[PDB]
Amino acid sequence: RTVFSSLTVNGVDLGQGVAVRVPSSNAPVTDIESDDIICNTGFIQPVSKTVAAVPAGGTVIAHFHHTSAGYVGPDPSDPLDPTNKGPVLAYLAKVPDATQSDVTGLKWFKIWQDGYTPATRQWGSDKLFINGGNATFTIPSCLQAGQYLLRVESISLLNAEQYPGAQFFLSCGQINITGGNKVQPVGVDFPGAYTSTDPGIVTDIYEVGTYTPPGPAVFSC
Template sequence: MLSSTVLFSAALGLVNAHTIFQRVYVNGVDQGWTTGVRYPSYDGPITNVSSTDIICNGGLNPLVTPYSQTVIDIPAGATVTGEWHHGLQPDGYNPSDLADPIDISHLGPVMAYMAAVPSALQTDVTDLKWFKIWEDGFDGTYWGVNRLYNAHGLQNFTIPTCIPAGNYFLRLEIIALHGASVYPGAQFYMECAQINVTGGGSTSPATVSFPGAYAGTDPGITIDIYYPTVTNYTIPGPSVFTCGGSSPTTTSTSTKATSTSTTSTTVKTTTTTSSSTTSTSTTKASTTTTSATSTATGTVAQYGQCGGLTYTGSTVCASPYVCTYSSAYYSQCL
């Protein structure tokens, strides 16, 4: 019997709903489209965690050169917003594109890393030491990608107050797990921004290397998120570094940052678990934009779409399956 992920992968093969991180806001102030960001012309994924392309993208998705010569100044403790979109979109969120900022089927975690560098304008990104400053995984019902989608591609987090001032690369990442039941199958989307942290302190975080931080055997990288029901999800990579030693998770918000000096709002959620990289759940969250074909009687087959705001097909599932709510845009026969 084919796994549900294989079935979903086949159905989604016609969909090229990928994503690119392409804009930075600092305390709500827009730094400009692609300013200070190393971005590709194509929004495809990286699937090999052992490739140097996992660092800041490239390879199959060549980065646009010459790189931006801007280094974005960010005060320690500032709220930073990264903006993702389906392809390069200088005008921002496109409400007519249901796959913007990313296809809602591409469920998985969203993360942010930093690495200190002598110069944020250097071309070489290898052999750097990275630390994770933010992550949003699975809360038992929704994934980080669900929240990013609902926030129209805005990813909010805070620069640690205690790290030393200086140049850094800021690496934002999404891992899409809709085809991750085998390796390679998970899709990694990442870009790096060139930043300069001002203020700060003298704490040196523990670090990891890319490649090296992830392995194809990691349970957060090779996983069938559709069947059996997900009860535990471990976000890949290290724990989130925080100056106080705790690791809260900051979720995406639906309030778009502006070009004024107004500080954008960051919504924080807390859990009762002791580990920042593990969430537990009793409910499976699964979604896609491609519906299974209804049967001759007007019912929807197992794993097919049966509801959602833009859905116009049958809402009746073939027996014994039940139309199960996943998001405002998607319900599925399970």
């Protein structure tokens, strides 16, 4: 179990819960056809009305911790329980207002993921753990400036031998991309992009040889 609950933008920590819609607990989303797959559910109120200004090309850290509280000292399952092998993924969607409550019907493009490396048997979850919950990635430099949601997700495949089984731990950050260019990427639907036939979602981790994370290929400029 894990929760994305804070952001750093080009080395500046924004603060616990700031510009993130933080779920009330670390309970997983398990239904890929639920609207809960978009940005989770049951947000801590009142939800932040901060929209983090981020230059296109800028470096963002999405901070995962074991619980919705963020860092509360030593915990062997902070940022996640390391037995919970799986990928880490980041997506953006262009939105009219990054504080708007309705997150349905958006078009999500993947900007980063950390899957599995067979030769080292290392998962993105392992790297996330080593990195103290820091999922660090850059915002594509060519993107159209404006308001976006930043969906960052940790998937535990520990029990993903059938569907339902995969456990999805995700939140949406609220960002305002500045500078940039004019690229408006093709995105996918949530729900929709993840299906019960995807070997990225239905996976026996004790029988993994190669692994491909679910969803579209990573967008690059």
